[PDB]
Amino acid sequence: FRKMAFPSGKVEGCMVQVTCGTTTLNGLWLDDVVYCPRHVICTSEDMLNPNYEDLLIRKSNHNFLVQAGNVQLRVIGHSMQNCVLKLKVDTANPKTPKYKFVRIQPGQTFSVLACYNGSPSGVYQCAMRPNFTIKGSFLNGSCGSVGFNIDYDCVSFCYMHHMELPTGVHAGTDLEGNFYGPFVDRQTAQAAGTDTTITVNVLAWLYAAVINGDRWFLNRFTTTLNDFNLVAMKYNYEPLTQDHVDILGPLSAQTGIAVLDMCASLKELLQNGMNGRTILGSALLEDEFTPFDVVRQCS
């Protein structure tokens, strides 16, 4: 199993840069709107505890430089939606894909197109941690880079990059400007919750092992979902939700192993350990592959 990103070309065709004064970050150009982090309007002094509404009132359309490459896109309207700035521009992006804006759940994976000055540098897959942070590669100027999934020819945009936390992890918003997690777009020190292991993805990984014929860890018993969640919490595993049970349906059907039976198998691994053994060639359980990722690389 490799971490595999979606092909990035449909998102590359939407990347622009947005500049206020000397501050430049990336924007997303879809139809005749450019979306970017609202802190592009912030000076240094403004970043400690900005009054975004007051800062934006002082802004006019002609204070915003939007460029696709070296080509300027004229701004004809501006508004703020939560922590995202929306810039209406006078040109509809001819490369606009079919798209949606989705807010993902913790544990879900997505591709990030890391971008600097409106130019993509690289693409990689990220899992959103249970504490709503991501472990990316984001250097200065990366804000406004987006995360996405692609289903058929439809791009589901789910993340826009805004900030780094003291531990080195990253935080940002959905494309409606609402942060994932208890974070704010102020340059104050902020703490992520204690992270936990993504239980549903570990379960997907166990299903993947079974699909490949590696099934020593399967036991003859089942469990309740509440029993598992109480036990799992003691090992720093995320409690399972009903949505988690539902997204494991395809893999449960593929293997004939009921979700709660795999939960019992995992409970035993947590309490007893691997006792010298490996799963899929590894002594560690993997938690960054979703049920959907498993089906993509096996089938």
Ligand X SMILES: *[C@@H](O)[C@H](C[C@@H]1CCNC1=O)NC(=O)[C@H](CC(C)C)NC(=O)OC[C@@H]1CCC(=O)N1Cc1cccc(Cl)c1
Q: Which of residues 130-169 bind ligand X (CB under 6 A)?
A: 138-140, 142-143, 162-166
Q: Which of 20, 36, 39, 162 is catalytic?
A: 39
Q: Which of residues 116-145 bind a copy of itself (CB under 8 A)?
A: 120-124, 135-137, 139
Cβ atoms of 37 and 142 closer than 8 Å? no
Among 13, 97, 239, 250, binds a copy of itself (CB under 8 A): 13
Burial class (CB in 10 A: 0-12, 13-18, 19+), 134: buried
Does 65 bind ligand X (CB under 6 A)? Our answer is no
Q: Which of 20, 115, 143, 158 is catalytic?
A: 143
Does 170 bind ligand X (CB under 6 A)? Our answer is yes
Burial class (CB in 10 A: 0-12, 13-18, 19+), 222: middle
DSSP for residue 220: S
Give the binding-site size for a copy of itself (rule: CB under 8 A). Answer: 33
Q: How far apart are CA 180 and CA 238, in angstroms?
A: 17
The closest of 251, 243, 249, 239 to 197, measured between CA atoms, is 239
Among 25, 68, 158, 204, binds ligand X (CB under 6 A): 25
Cβ atoms of 29 and 15 closer than 8 Å? yes
Among 96, 187, 222, 229, binds ligand X (CB under 6 A): 187
Q: How far apart are CA 135 and CA 165, in angstroms?
A: 10
Which does residue 122 bind out of a copy of itself, ligand X, none, counting CB within 5 to 8 angstroms by kind?
Answer: a copy of itself
Query: In whole angstroms, how close is the CB of 32 to ligand X at the nearest point?
Result: 24
Which does residue 25 bind out of a copy of itself, ligand X, none, counting CB within 5 to 8 angstroms by kind?
Answer: ligand X
Is 126 considered catalytic here?
no
- Show the CA angle centred on residue 123, arms to residues 122 and 125, nearest 5°: 145
CB neighbours of 152 closer than 8 A, spacing ≥ 6? none
Which does residue 6 bind out of ligand X, a copy of itself, none, counting CB within 5 to 8 angstroms by kind?
Answer: a copy of itself
CB-nearer residue toward a copy of itself: 219 or 254: 254
CB-nearer residue toward ligand X: 138 or 228: 138
Does 21 bind a copy of itself (CB under 8 A)? Our answer is no
Give CA separation, 102 vs 56, 110, 149, 212, 282, in Å: 26, 11, 9, 32, 33
Is 39 considered catalytic here?
yes
Q: How far apart are CA 271 and CA 268, in angstroms?
A: 5
Does 5 bind a copy of itself (CB under 8 A)? Our answer is yes
Cβ atoms of 114 and 147 closer than 8 Å? no
Stretch that binds a copy of itself, among 2-10, 57-65, 83-91, 174-182 (CB under 8 A): 2-10
Q: Would you state the structure tokens that stand for residue 61, as one six-digit string? A: 């359309």
DSSP for residue 41: G
Active site residues: 39, 143
Under the rule (CB under 8 A), what is the footprint of a copy of itself?
1-10, 12-13, 113-114, 120-124, 135-137, 139, 168, 212-213, 278, 282-284, 296-297, 299
